[model samples]
Target chain A: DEFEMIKRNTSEIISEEELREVLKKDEKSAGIGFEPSGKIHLGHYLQIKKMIDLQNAGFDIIILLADLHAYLNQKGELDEIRKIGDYNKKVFEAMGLKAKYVYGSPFQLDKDYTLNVYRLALKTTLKRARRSMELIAREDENPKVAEVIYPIMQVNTSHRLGVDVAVGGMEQRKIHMLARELLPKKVVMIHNPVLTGLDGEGKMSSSKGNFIAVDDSPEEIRAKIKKAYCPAGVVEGNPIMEIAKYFLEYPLTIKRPEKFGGDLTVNSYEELESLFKNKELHPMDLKNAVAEELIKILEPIRKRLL
Target chain B: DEFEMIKRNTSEIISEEELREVLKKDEKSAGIGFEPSGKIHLGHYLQIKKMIDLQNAGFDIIILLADLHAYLNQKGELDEIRKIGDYNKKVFEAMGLKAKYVYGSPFQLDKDYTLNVYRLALKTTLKRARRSMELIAREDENPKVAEVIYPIMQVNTSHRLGVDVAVGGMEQRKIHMLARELLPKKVVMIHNPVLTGLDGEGKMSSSKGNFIAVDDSPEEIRAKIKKAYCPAGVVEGNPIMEIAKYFLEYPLTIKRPEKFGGDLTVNSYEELESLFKNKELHPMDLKNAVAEELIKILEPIRKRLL
Candidate 1:
């Protein structure tokens, strides 16, 4: 069950053996880092939720509010980024995720840390550094030197944080792989699924303004969900269906008017998917049910933030 | 006369206007940085000599003992590099270079300095960074990320050190140009000539072992000068002749046996060059006189070092 919980709703684990090995240790710590953002969306929650699973499995959780990274990316100044980081910490707490929170500025600028960055930089090639940023880097024909340094800093963070298990969405796989190869100690990598944006485009992201924030009020949630991309019988690339699969509880209820279909309930994600794929569940009904469920999950968190 | 003194024996000044502007200031500072080396060669002294010229023009001098840069280039650890840096500081002081000597580690690891490095990195591109290292970088088919960062740090160093004039050998032209373009404040750049090594292969450098160290004993100097590359009737690429031009104070004495045209004295570098090009000067006699003049200049420094 411990292993199952760790693997649930995940895309892939780098090595099951290393995961099991770290799981056996009595005192183990897992961490996930995020450049401080203006909004913490469902995509962030997808990884934060996995961190919660790790916490329940007796692992100490550490959340890295990467303020220096944000500053390097030109998100804002350190003072402003730290304020955003503080808000992010509260948002994670509001999601019912408990973890030791650390801002990157304190240790990232330490003598030893800065020195090791140069050490890592000496070994990493321009080619590899550029390749590592493909999934996460800003699309620039001529990228900056900071693009290369960003990955080196990310790799060093794992070693500096003393994390046994490093977690992120699949977008972080390349950087995490670099960490696994370059860090002084090995870290188990957990890549969670990237939640498709409500527009059914790329992953939900703060910059894109495509997905629902965890603290979105009821009206915002319903509006985002009402316009979400959900084809009548398409399972693939369906954002509303993806939400149903990842966020909803089993024995899910779909309430509808008597004319359309009085009400329906499914005991599992597979049953829900099968019903949707078979067109027995209408897209309209699916949106209505997914929106209400998302509201149920997010309303308390919003209240907690207040 | 101040401008003439500043321009003498120098390769090029980027802009005559900027040099004049900075020269007009009541109190000005000029800096030259060197990654610590096992041997301080004539190439180093060539730059140091120009720095002294700047000092004569009433500019306060700053010598950067780049220990952190040496470590990044994989020369040695910081402790050992700083030791070398200390020895280098003494070498500069012994050469009658009176000024403040700063080690790179003290401020390179500071929060603001490191942050500015990232800021500069964000603006610099991989292509431009790679091009900057063409003359100075090690021979590598595939260079490391450190190669790029090294230039960015060099650029930042000028800004961080508050240097009004940045001096280096011709190999540093690209990076100096980068600093001139990227620094928040404009700095006058002084490009000094790179003294050809004794073997006449390239610039006199510590790693090549083709250099004459400032602290070389009289015997060592003679031995090195004796085997140095010099050809009769050839002045270009003749390291010994170049030395006679840069180091020897005119009128120069060419002591010789009665059989070899007796003793000779030249009024200026031009006269000496004309004699050497006309084959009136022999390589053997030139080496002998160059060694003696070098010994005269270096002996006091060697004694000071002792």
Candidate 2:
């Protein structure tokens, strides 16, 4: 029940028992790393929370600042992006999610970035890079050579730090896959799901404005959810219901006016979806109710936002 | 008369006095350079002879052993090809060409070749490289990235050597044109006509097996020329005749066969060509006669080859 609760309540699915088992069998320790490419949105909070939870479970955590990756993604505005990343360090520290090891890539700047990566990529081939890009391009179609190099840098970081396990979002499956294939036959990969956006359209992303920032005010949170897309009798496709089921660990229930439908209290997401599919629950009522509940759930994090 | 002699002899119709005047006023010096990729063939000899003629005429001479270009061209057998280039240096020296300026690109093996050239090309653009490639590809289809780098390298060589004139075959006209357009203002370009193969069908090339090496035995030269393709009444199209008319300073009518209805005593190549082109001269008689004369002309070089 505790494992199920842990899996259902967060983007990360590891349990205390599994963590203990991993620690017992480990040849080398795991490290926690994050890319501070942009502002810490809700998606990052889930990761930070997972890291803190892992720390509580007694595993060592290493939070890599990924300043190079941030600069790479930000392109030529590396100085500005790095400045922003430095500010996010304070955010991580304030939330008590700062890991024991904090490392950045600025130290590698003296080695020519273009020359080194070009040689590394050539050590593979244009064909191999194209194959990697085909998978990565699904997320970002016009991924640059830097985007391609980011995975190599991450894998190199893991090897350099002697990290046994690399942890990141499911969207980073391609990058983690690269590490699994490229790393020196020892590192393990652990993936977590990306948080869905406030708009409930796709994965939580700042570029799409489908993100709930950690710094979002209660009014901002309310406004975002109020504009979310959710249809009823289609609970399986409803983003709000998915978020509540995945993030809140709440029993599924929907109260409706007698004229529209009878009141229903479902013990599980499946039961709620069955009712919604049978038209016992309306979409608008479900969306409004879920939005109201999410605001309450995120209230603690909102209070901590400066 | 000297002006008339030049116009009558070479494919290009320029007065000898004008050529001398231009050569005097030009203050510009030129040289021919090459990478020894393979055994120096007959086609190569023609070009080398042209270089020697230019050198004798008081131009600066440079003979670059494009070992890097050879490496790029013969990637699979680069080391073997480089050794072959070393053996070919003797041939260059035997031909009385200057060997002091001879240098190999392999000297830069410790450095990054592609990155160096890439940075140089990038200072231009994809558009500029593409345009340069279009012109170069017309001369050499299936142009490798090395071929694309060829123009940049050639231009850089001229700039580095401080040469006023860059000389190459007509096929290299586009590369020289690019140098003229893109290189620093002082460098001038001089391109000679493409020598026809012994087959008289395509460009003279050892790869095509239609070239007559300068070092060919007198018997070998006689045999090759005897079997050469010189169609009836096509004296101008005969590669051997073209070579003789261009390289040797003989009175045009000195050896005209009486059967071809020429005055045999008339002076200059114009009279010879006029007699031949008007169907008064038989191509076979002329080809056989030139073959005999060529052996005599090349007797000293043939002795050196032995």
Candidate 3:
């Protein structure tokens, strides 16, 4: 059950067997780091829910607010980034994910930590190091030296934090794989699925403003979900369906009028996905059900943020 | 005179005016950093002597033992490099450089120092950073990320140490210039000439076994000097001639048997160069004179090492 919970909705696990063995032990920790963003949107929420799953599976959670990485990413100055990082910690806490909140600025600069990063840098090739940042780097035309060092620092982050399992979205797979290769100790890696944006473009990113924030008002949530890309009878690459799959609990109910095939109830996500794939569920009905469920799920967090 | 002594054997100075203005200040410091070497050779001594000249020119001296850089360069482990660094410090002190001795390990891992490096990395392009390591990196075919970060750390070294002027051999010109461009503070960069090896192959390097150690015995000095690359009637690119110019305080005397030429004395490196250029001086005579002079110059340091 713990393994299932940990593996649920994940895009991939580096080693399912390794995670299985790790779950057998108590006092294990799983960590995921984030560059402090202006808005913690659904993409971040998807990853946060994965962290929660790890937490519920008897893993102590460690959330790394990578302020240094934010500065390197050109998000803001250190003080400003740190302020955003503190706010980010508050948001994660507000979401009811109780765990250790660690700011990278604290240990990332320690002598041992810095030395480990240098050691990792020595082992990593320039091309491979640069490749790991394909999705994470902000400046692609002419990348800065910071772009390469950022990934090494991240690898060292997991090592220094003593994380048993490193968690992130699929965009972090390359870096996570690098960590698995370079870290002196073994770490199970869990990569969650990246949510498509409401605009059906890239991931639901804060910079793109393409998805709902956990603290979004109920009306805002409804509006965002209504505008989200979801094709009728097409479960694939659909943001609304992805949200419903990951965010909504099982035994879902979709209300409809008598003319439009009344109210429908499904006990499992498999049943719901089968109905949607078989062209039995309407996109509007799906969007309404997903939006209301998201509202209910996020209401406590929304209130906590306020 | 202060300016002349400081500029005497240096190959290039980033800006003569910046150095002149720097010399106008009462409390000024100049620094040169070294990667810890198994043997502190004549190449290192040339840079060390330049630091000595800077010391005599009313500037405080700071010697940086870059054990971290040595590790990146594949010299040895940190502990092993540090042991060598301590010995290197002893050798510099024995050669009579009385100034602040700083190890890179001390402040290099500090929060402020690492953050400054990250900031510098943010400002530096990977292309430019990689170019700066052209001569410094040990592995060239498939370069490691350490190769690029090494130059950035060196740039930050000058900035962190607060050195008014940074000194290195001509090989360091690229990195020092990068430091000049990227450092938040202004630092006058002095580039000393690199010595050709005894075998006439390349720069006198420890790895090549073509260098004379500073702590070499009198006979060891004679042997290495006798084997040194010195072309007759050609002073250019001559390691022996280069050594004489940089090491031997001029008013350099050349003693010869009556058959060859009676004892000769030149008042300046220019006069010595003139004689050597005209075929008035023989390579054997130059070697004998240089060996004896080197013996005298290094005798005290050799004794100190013991």
**Cα RMSD (Å) per model?**
2.9, 8.5, 3.0
Candidate 2 ranges beyond 4 A from true positions: A1-306, B1-35, B53-60, B99-104, B107-116, B120-163, B175-186, B235-237, B252-268, B296-306
**TM-score of every prediction relative to native:** 0.90, 0.58, 0.90
Ranking by TM-score: 1, 3, 2
Off by over 4 Å in 1: A217-223, A231-233, A255-262, A278-282, B24-26, B140-142, B217-228, B231-233, B255-264, B278-292, B302-306
Model 1 TM-score (2 dp): 0.90
lDDT of 2 by residue, B1-306 (tens): 433322232234223343555467535455666656455655566566766666656666777766655544433344675676676776766666673455545333323333333334434432454455442332333333343445565656665566654656666665565566665554555555666778778877646678777777778878887888776657656786676566555663345545655445436566667766776666666665677666665666656556
Candidate 3 lDDT by residue in tens digits, A1-306: 788877878888888998888988878998988999878887888888888888888888888888988887778798899999999998988878898887878777787888888898888889998888888888557788888898888888877788889988888989888888887787988888888888787877777788788889999989988888888788778888888788888899888888999999989888988899888998889988999999999999889888
Per-residue lDDT over A1-306 for candidate 2, one digit per residue giving the tens place of the 0 to 100 score: 322322434444234454434656535355656555466776676666666665655556777776665554433344675676676776676567646645455433323443333234323332344355442332443433344445555555666667645566766666566555655555555566666666666777766688777667777867776777666566544556666565554474566677876565667767766766887667677666666666776666556654
- Clashing residue pairs in candidate 2 are A232-A283, B3-B16, B35-B66
Clashes of each: 0, 3, 0
lDDT for each residue of candidate 1 in A246-270, tens digit (9 for 90 to 100): 8888899899998987989899999
Lowest summed lDDT over 10 consecutive residues: which window, candidate 2 chain A?
A: A117-126
Q: What is the per-residue lDDT of model 3 for residues B1-306, given as tens digits with 9 covering 90 to 100?
A: 889888887899899999999999999999998898889998888888889889988889999989988887777699989999998999999988999988898888887888888888888889998888877788557788888889999988887788889898888888887877876688999998888888888878888899999988888889988887788878778988888888897798899988988899999888988899998999999999999998998999998889
Expressed as tens digits, the lDDT of each residue in B4-81 for candidate 1 is 898888899989899999889999999999999889988888889899999999999999999887777768688999
By lDDT, is 2 or 3 better?
A: 3
